[PDB]
Each structure stands twice: as structure tokens, then as C-alpha cells.
């Protein structure tokens, strides 16, 4: 019932990845909510359960498949299915816990991890920060295998955490930020794996704040500037939504849009 988008690392190209991210964005947003040319994800408040999730079915050259479940309100990876087993991150609240009972309902083995799925927690378990975890088609290929073999004992917890970190950035972050999608396209074009630079990391860390600053802005003007980083780690100040239009593709819902004038 929930929409499924397919992607494979097997012979992936810039174009096939671009098609995939475009499809994900299309299933995440309805087109109802666009502010300063930037689409907003659906409001969690009053969102019917039959509209809450999308599924991303990842296949690889190894002929293995996993299905990630993404929450449409924030593009968050809430869990995954591999064959006979499904695994969910520890829910933040009771309504999220109920929500995930609507996912992978025919799976034989349902597990909820005792840990949450935020970067802080995942990096701790991985024993590596995002800045030291390589991204690209190769890492994603390997991540799909690692997720697939977890239930049978083939995948250690740090490798599982690492693999989540890869999937989240190459799917959810790429969906959120055209800039991050661009960085992943480059890695695919040249088949060259590399850890995310500070421009990628700071955008990921700032998604919530950027969403709020845009939505609370006075005609696009931020009350408080937001500091990002360039690829070389130097500071970049954001004062206005205008500079972000080519960078951010989707925002989390943070407030109601003010009336026009």
C-alpha cells in the first residue's frame, strides 16, 4: 500500500541515481506546500497513517535486496526489512511506535532496536564519525549487503551502524539537499568513494534550523544568520533563503506559512 521506489547500485550511473532521488522527492512531498520556491514535507499533525511512509527498495550487484522505510514528515529512515526480518530504530514517542506497526506487517520476525537512529548514536556504535565514513556507489553496494546479512550474524553492530550512516546520507540527505545529491552524483560519475567534506556535514547538521529560519523569515530574510562551512572548512554565513534555493530541495514542516501582503 505504501509507495515503493527502486534503486540498484548494480551498474548505477549519474542518470539512474538522479531518477531515483527525483522519484523519492516526488513520493515525499505532495506539492501542497512550497515556500520561497522550496517544497515543505507534510505536517505530522493530522497526517493519516496510510500516507505516513514510503519504501525504498535497494538492490545491489550481489543480487541482494533490502527495503528501507522512510517517514514522509522528515525523510527519516525509521527501519528496514531484509527477507524474513524487519528492524526498527527505537521510537522517540508512543505515536511513532504505533506508526511503525503499520510497516512490513507480513514479516515473520519484527525487532525494535534499543537504540535510536540519529547520527550521534549511529556514529557512537560505528566507532567512526561521518567525516571518516566513505560514501559512493561502492560503500552503498557494501551497505546493502551488510544490512541484508545482519539477521544471520554475518554483520557486526559497528558495520551495521556504518551501513545505516551510508544509506541515510545517500538517500535521505540527498533527497533533502540538491547540493548533497550533487556530491553523490560526482562520486558515482567517477566511481570514487570519499568521506563527506564539511559542506556536506554542516548542511546535514543544519537541516532543522535552516527549515525553521526559512519558514520564520521576514519575506525570506533571516532574523539570525546561520553559519555553514565550505568544502575547505571555512565559514559561510546564510542571511536569506535566496542563497539556499539551489542547495535545499525539501524542508521539514516547522510552522504555518504567514499570510501574504
Author numbering: 5 to 265
Paper text:
Co-crystals of RTA with 4a and 4b were prepared using the hanging drop vapor diffusion crystallization method and their crystal structures were analyzed. In each case, the pterin ring interacted with Gly121, Asn122, Tyr123, Ile172, and Arg180 in the primary pocket of RTA through the same interactions as those previously observed with other pterin derivatives. For 4a, the tripeptide moiety was unsuccessfully assigned, probably because only the pterin moiety was accommodated in the primary pocket and the pendant moiety was free to move. For 4A, the displacement of Tyr80, as well as the T-shaped interactions, were not observed, even though it had the same P1-P2 moiety, Gly-Phe. It is likely that the alkyl chain of the C-terminal residue in 4A is not long enough to form the hydrogen bonds with the residues at the entrance of the secondary pocket; consequently, the unfixed large side chain is free to move, preventing the phenyl ring in P2 from forming a T-shape interaction. The same movements of Tyr80 were observed in the crystal structures of RTA with the potent inhibitors 1, 2, while no such conformational change was observed in RTA crystals with 4a and other low-activity inhibitors such as 3, for which the positions of Tyr80 was the same as in the inhibitor-free crystal structure. Compound 4b exhibited an IC50 value of 33.4±2.7 μM, whereas compound 4a exhibited an IC50 value of 485±33 μM. The weak inhibitory activity of 4a was comparable to that of pterin-7-carboxylic acid, which is consistent with the fact that only the pterin-7-carboxylic acid portion was assigned in the X-ray crystallography of 4a/RTA and no conformational change in Tyr80 was observed.
Ricin is an AB toxin consisting of an enzymatically active A subunit (Ricin Toxin A-chain, RTA) and a cell-binding B subunit (Ricin Toxin B-chain, RTB) linked by a disulfide bond. RTA is highly catalytically active in depurinating the adenine base at position 4324 (A4324) selectively in a specific region in the 28S rRNA to inhibit ribosomal protein biosynthesis, causing cell death. The active site of RTA consists of two pockets, the primary pocket catalyzing the depurination of A4324 and the secondary pocket accommodating the guanine residue adjacent to A4324, with Tyr80 dividing these pockets. Thus, in this study, we report the synthesis of 7PCAs with tripeptide pendants having elongated C-terminal residues, in which ornithine and lysine residues with an aromatic ring were employed as the C-terminal residues to direct the interaction with the secondary pocket.
